[PDB]
Write a protein that binds this ligand. Sequence first.
Ligand SMILES: [C]C1=C([C])[C]=C2C(=[C]1)N([C][C]([O])[C]([O])[C]([O])[C]OP([O])(=O)OP([O])(=O)O[C][C]1O[C](N3[C]=NC4=C3N=[C]N=C4[N])[C]([O])[C]1[O])C1=NC(=O)[N]C(=O)C1=N2C(=O)[C][C]C1=C(F)[C]=C(Br)C(F)=[C]1
Length: 647
Amino acid sequence: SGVEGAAFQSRLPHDRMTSQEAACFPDIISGPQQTQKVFLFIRNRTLQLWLDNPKIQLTFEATLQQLEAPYNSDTVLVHRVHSYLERHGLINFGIYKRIKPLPTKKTGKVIIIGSGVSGLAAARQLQSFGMDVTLLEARDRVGGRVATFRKGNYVADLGAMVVTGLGGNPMAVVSKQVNMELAKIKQKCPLYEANGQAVPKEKDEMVEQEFNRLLEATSYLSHQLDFNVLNNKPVSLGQALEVVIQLQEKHVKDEQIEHWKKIVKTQEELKELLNKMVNLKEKIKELHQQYKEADITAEFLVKSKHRDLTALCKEYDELAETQGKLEEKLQELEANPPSDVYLSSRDRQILDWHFANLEFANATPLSTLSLKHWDQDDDFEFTGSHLTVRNGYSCVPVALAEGLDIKLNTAVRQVRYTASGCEVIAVNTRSTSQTFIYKCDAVLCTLPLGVLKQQPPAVQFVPPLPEWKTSAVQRMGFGNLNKVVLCFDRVFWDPSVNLFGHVGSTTASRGELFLFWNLYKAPILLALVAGEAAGIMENISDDVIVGRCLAILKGIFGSSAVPQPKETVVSRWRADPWARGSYSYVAAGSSGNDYDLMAQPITPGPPIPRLFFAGEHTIRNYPATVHGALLSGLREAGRIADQFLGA
Ligand SMILES: [C]C1=C([C])[C]=C2C(=[C]1)N([C][C]([O])[C]([O])[C]([O])[C]OP([O])(=O)OP([O])(=O)O[C][C]1O[C](N3[C]=NC4=C3N=[C]N=C4[N])[C]([O])[C]1[O])C1=NC(=O)[N]C(=O)C1=N2C(=O)[C][C]C1=C(F)[C]=C(Br)C(F)=[C]1
């Protein structure tokens, strides 16, 4: 429906109040049923007015205008709902035309660390809420792990590039605001063995089906058999995968054993039978010989001896009947063996492709993932096809940055927080002699988890962060994933296909250049380096890793079809000191709860919160994404405004 759809698009149930709404509106839940229905309608229709036209600010007055009777009559409740939705960033978020220009005297001074999507989203909110906001960004650009290469007509995303579903996705709103050109990803992804041969359809299908089968087995082990802690250690997804493969190998070998036993037994029966038919030919040879040796006792003798001779033949002809029905049963058995192996050597390599794809999706080798929790975010997937940003995802943070006080080339080195306020200390990345000191009432830290894990610390906290936060930083996974960009002057691949896969020769290197993306207007390919290969490959110079791309592609389309690229780019996110990786993942021995702990603000001991945290690693239901980064900034802006302007 329509107002129904607005709730859905806001990740809210259209027909009941959430717990957050129940806290901010206790008189509503405690009150008559009909009025709680009134609340839900005001909320849904207010979301719908906004989502219908997310390019201009939706004011209280304008909401009151467009409410039909009797709703437009309950002026106070409308204001309460509008204010709540605005405060929590469910309306008037992203970038939109302000109706009321910004309050001229600010209230409260917030420093935001980092100018990625989480920091920008929070920043625009705090500025709308009337606060003095400055961002400190260490790079010479905004966007952080949204990073787009642009030169000539070439566009290519080195960080995030995929928009997941649009249903429920806040990026659907930002896309409308920023005029993002999205494009649904076509599902077809042909695979080429390491020699360049296409994987036949039967094998692509067969192997993929066994991949889905194996993964659900690990989920059955985890969530039905509690196979989660083994010998004091938490089970990794990769470890579970080796277990369920080992059992399929055992089953294959068992039916092979039973089959050899059927054969031997039937062979022994034939062996025994043929010997026994032999002794009956000897018994007939010995009676046949007495038949030519042949009076009324000799007259009756022939009848008796013919009766005798032809009865042993009826024994023998009958046995050659059983002789047939055996060597038939035998002949069929040598014809229909069960499988000799669970996975042929090529089958295994193809299967390792699908594992690599999963190491791509999680930015880490499977042996590092929590078996129990690595997909704990799946209940929150958006609906609709996934899309790529044909014009470069940077358009989002660049649009978000408009009008913000953003200080680039300004690297934070120490964050001091006390009951009386905060001081952020930064150096200029261009003249590290130059030092700045930023007094403020609160600090929002969107530093990536990779930077927080850095030992010795890139950024120092005074006082040090509490143990409960630092141990969560240490538990959580921070993965890695890299891209090679190949720009050509001509398209030599299939333009109808967005994706094709390269199947590697070994398990350990299964993620090296395993997936190619065809996303853009100019002749560009992205190749992913995933899993174990991600971090190791950063140690290869661009020229050589590109040479290896060109070799794979020349294997697939021929050596004459692949010209030398005109421009190349290679990401190295792990060695990037402003990132130290690509995104978080749920490590074995962590859980979604560490994402809540990460979001927890800090209060210096007796008191009011001072140090706040946003970023993809702080949002339990949408981690490792752009939209989760965005939602996390919006959340912290609400939390900070509640504290410094009133709830
Ligand atoms: C890297 C990457 C790649 C390569 C790819 C991708 C990605 C990544 N992803 C993820 C995203 O991107 C993320 O999450 C976001 O971006 C977030 O963000 P934040 O949180 O905001 O962070 P950043 O950006 O980084 O920011 C921060 C800042 O800070 C700064 N600094 C540092 N240090 C310092 C500073 N400042 C001052 N001082 C100092 N000291 C920096 O520089 C920055 O700026 C993604 N996502 C999405 O959504 N999509 C996509 O596509 C992506 N990608 C891939 O490809 C895949 C992934 C994924 C997907 F797709 C899906 C899903 Br469900 C998942 F999970 C994932």
